[PDB]
C-alpha cells in the first residue's frame, strides 16, 4: 500500500505547483460541546439544505476557516519540538516561533502551512482548507449553558446576596458532522505523512481548548487529482440530499454515505485522478500511517527526511 | 456534440480578429467565505436596481477585473506543468515564468490571456473580462468577522502583557451570486477546451486562497458570434428585474431563470448569433468536455496540438 | 519502581509544550444521587449506543465542561493551603484569592489548572478534561426527590400545609458510571504527583458540600504519549459495545473490562507511548503515591519543590 504510494509523489518541493494536489475528505463528528465563534455568538449562515431534492433554506453552524485549521497545525509543532527538530529555547539554533518575527523560515510546519514577517518575505499555505458547515440544521445541533462562578467559601456569595449576571455561553451537540475536504498542494512522501499526521493525531479544536472540543477525524477517502474537487458546501449539501435529511441515523452509516456521495461527485468532476483510496483500501493505508508513527524510529527517519527536504527548499526557493 | 463546434472555429490563431467570439455566461456561486479586496475593505458601488424595479441607489459587491481572470488563468499554467509542455525551473529549453523580468512568448496562457516585458515584445488577451457584480446587496451579502493571533502557549500574554494582535476582516457569505460573461476571440478548438477548462477546473478565486473563496461556476450558456454582448452588470440587472427581488431561491432556479434571461437579452443585441448552446446541449457539451479533461491520453493530445499552434502563432504572427 | 517513571517527566516547567502528556482513564463511580447541573434538569444527550451492534435512541446523562474540573481543583487548593505553601488570609505575602486582582499568578493551581485576570495577566491549563458522558441510559439512570423547608420552627402539621418552594426534583441513580479521560501537558514529576492525588482524592461533586453528591474515582489506567487519547464520548461508546448493553453485572466486571478496552483503543491511535499503566502495575503504583499522601513529611518535600518549579516558572515565562 504505502510503497506503492510513493510514486504519486515529487522527489523534493518544487519551485511552483506541478499540479499534484493530494484531497482528504474527511467527516468531523462533534464530540464534547466545541464551540466555534468570532463574536459573543456561535457563527452560523443560512445555505441550501440539498441540491436538488431539499430545497428549502437552512441555517448551519460555520466551522469558520481558521477552527478549521490551526489546531492541526499547532499540534505539528508539537510532534516537530518532541523529535527534537526544533526548540523553543530562545539561545538555541533550532529556534521556531509561532506568530512572531522569531518565527523560522526552515522547518515543516513553516513550509507545509505558511509564514509572513516582512523581513525574509513570506510562504503561502500548501495546506489549502475551507470553512465546513454542519450537515443539519443549527436549530437542532445546539444548546445555550449557564456558566457558574462561586467563590473559595463553597458559596455563592461575598456576604448577604449572590454574584449579580451569571453569564450563558452557546456550544454545538454532540454527533453533529462538519463535512470537510482538506487538500494538499505539490507535496513530498514525508510531507504527506506529516499532514496526514496531522489530521488524524490532532483532536482538540473548539475554543475552549482544554475544556472542551475534542472531535473524531472520521477519513473517508484520499484522493489524488490534478486540481480542486467539490467545496466543503457542496460535500455538506450533496449528503444531505442523499439521506432526505434524515440525518439522525448511525455516525458508520454515514461515513458509508460520504464515501459514495464522495465517488459520484468525483465521477462529474473535470480533473485527471490518480488514485481514488476509499473503504478498505484506505482503512489499510490508515492503519498502516497508524504503524509509521506509534514507532520512534520510523517517525525519527520520516519527519528528519522531511525537515532535510524543507530546509533543502529553504536555502533554494525560500529565504536567501 | 463537440465534433460539430470544429466547424465554429478557425484553424489557426489569426494575425487579426476575425469576427469569431464564443461567450461563457455564468453564474459564479460562493462556496466559502469569498474576500474580493484591493484596499483592505470589500469593493462596492451603487447601482440601480434592475433594468426595471428601479432605483440609483442599490450597493452591490464588486468581484473586481482581475479577481476572476488570474485564479483562471494560473490554472491553466498549472496544467501546462502538469503535462509537461512547460516548466518551473532555471536551464530549462520551456521555462515560463509569470509577472517576470523576461517570460516565454510561445506557451497557451501567454497567447491567451497575454503577456508584456518592458525590454521586449507584448501580446492583447485573447479572453475578454469585465468587473463581476453581486445579484443582491452588499448589506445582505457580508458579515465582518474577528480574527486573533495569540502566542501558541494559549493566551495573547506575552509573559505578563497582553501583544493584542487583533482585527478584524470584512468576508462575503456564501450562496452569493455574482453574474459573469467571459468572452473569447479568434480561438481554435483546443484553445476553447483550454479556456472552457479553467473556467470549469479553477475554484479558489479571492485573497487568503488557502482559507477561503471556493466558488462554483455554473456555466448557463456558450453563445458562439460575431460581436461583443451584454455587461456582467446588464446581465445582472436584467436578473435582478425577472426575479424581482426574491434573491433567497434556489441554486436551480437560479441558473434555470438566468438562461432564460440571456435568451431575451440574446434577442436585443446586433449579432449574429451562430449557435446558442443552452439547456440540455450545454450539459451534454459540458458532460463531454468533462470526459475530455478526466482523460491523461486525450488532454494530452488537445493541448499539444494547442502548443503547437501557440507557438506557430508566435513564429509567425507573435513576439517570435 | 516509582523513581524509574521520574525519568519520563521534564526537569522543568517549558516555555511551550515540548509534546509530552500523561492521560489519566477513570470510570467514576456514582451513589449518593448526584446533581451535575445548577441551570434546569439533569443534562442529558441523545447518543448512538456504541460502535457496533448500535441504536441512536440513547439519550445518557453528561457530566458538563467544568463539573469535573472545578471539584478536583479545589479540593487540591484546599490541601496546598492545609500543608501550607499559600492562604486565603486577608494580607498575607503567600495569598492566592480564586477570583480577581489579586487573585494568583505562581502557585501550582494556577499554573497547572490555569487562570485570566480578565486583561492584566493569563495562563492557559496544564490539564484537559472534556464532558463525560455516563454509560448507560438517563430512564436506566434515573431517579427522584422534592425539596422542603424547615428554615425556623419548620412544624405546620395540623394545619396540612408546605412552602412554595415544594417541587419534584431528578437526581442520578446509584450504580451509574461516568467514563471520563483526563491529561496534562508538559508536567514535573511532583506536578505530576499533585495532579494525581487531586484526582485521587476528592469526593464531592456539583455545587455544594452537604447532602447529594459524592462519588469513587476508581482509576483503570495512566498512559504517557505524545498527543490526544479517545475522547470521553468514545470510551463510552466502546466500552457499552464490549459489555454488550447488560449493565446490572457487578462494578468489578466494569472495572476489568475497562483496561481490556483501553488496551485496544490505544493500539490503533496515531500516537507513541513511552508507557502505559493497567492492572497489576497500576494498583502497585496507586497504593505507593497514595503513601505520599499519607505521610505529610515527605508530602511537604514534593509540593515543596513544585511551589519552587511552579514559581520559578511564573517569572521565567508565565508572568514577570
Given at each position: 500500500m504505502l510503497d506503492s504510494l510513493?510514486?504519486?509523489?515529487?522527489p523534493s518541493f518544487p519551485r511552483l505547483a506541478s499540479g499534484h494536489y493530494v484531497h482528504f475528505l474527511m467527516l468531523r463528528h462533534s464530540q464534547s460541546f466545541p464551540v466555534f465563534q468570532t463574536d459573543g455568538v456561535l457563527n452560523t449562515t443560512r445555505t441550501q439544505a440539498g441540491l436538488l431534492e431539499k430545497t428549502d433554506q437552512l441555517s448551519r453552524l460555520v466551522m469558520f476557516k481558521r477552527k478549521q485549521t490551526t489546531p492541526e497545525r499547532l499540534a505539528g509543532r508539537e510532534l516537530l519540538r518532541n523529535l527534537g527538530?526544533?526548540?523553543?529555547?530562545?539561545?538555541?539554533?533550532?529556534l521556531c516561533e509561532y506568530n512572531?518575527?522569531?518565527?523560522?523560515?526552515?522547518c515543516p510546519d513553516c513550509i507545509l502551512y505558511g509564514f509572513a514577517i516582512g523581513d525574509s518575505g513570506s510562504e503561502r499555505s500548501k495546506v489549502y482548507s475551507d470553512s465546513a458547515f454542519s450537515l443539519g440544521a443549527y436549530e437542532q445541533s445546539h444548546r445555550s449553558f449557564t456558566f457558574n462562578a462561586p467563590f473559595?467559601?463553597?458559596?455563592?456569595?461575598?456576604?448577604g446576596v449572590m454574584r449579580s449576571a451569571i453569564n450563558e455561553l452557546d456550544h454545538i451537540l454532540p454527533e453533529v458532522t462538519f463535512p470537510t475536504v482538506e487538500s494538499l498542494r505539490d507535496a513530498t512522501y514525508e510531507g504527506f505523512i506529516y499532514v496526514l499526521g496531522n489530521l488524524l493525531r490532532t483532536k482538540r479544536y473548539g475554543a475552549q481548548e482544554s475544556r472542551t472540543?475534542?472531535?473524531?477525524?472520521?477519513?473517508v477517502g484520499i484522493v489524488f487529482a490534478d486540481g480542486e474537487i467539490f467545496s466543503n458546501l457542496h460535500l455538506t449539501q450533496a449528503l444531505y440530499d442523499q439521506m432526505g435529511?434524515?440525518?439522525?441515523?448511525p455516525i458508520s452509516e454515514l461515513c458509508e454515505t460520504a464515501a459514495t456521495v464522495a465517488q459520484d461527485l468525483l465521477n462529474k468532476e473535470p480533473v485527471r485522478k490518480s488514485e481514488l483510496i476509499f473503504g478498505a483500501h484506505l482503512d489499510t493505508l490508515l492503519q498502516e500511517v497508524n504503524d509509521i508513527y506509534q514507532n520512534d524510529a520510523e517517525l525519527t527517519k520520516l519527519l528528519g527526511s522531511l525537515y532535510q527536504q524543507t530546509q533543502d527548499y529553504a536555502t533554494e526557493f525560500g529565504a536567501l
Open positions: 510513493k510514486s504519486q509523489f515529487q527538530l526544533t526548540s523553543a529555547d530562545k539561545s538555541a539554533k533550532n512572531g518575527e522569531g518565527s523560522c523560515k526552515q473559595e467559601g463553597g458559596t455563592m456569595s461575598e456576604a472540543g475534542t472531535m473524531k477525524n472520521h477519513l435529511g434524515e440525518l439522525n441515523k
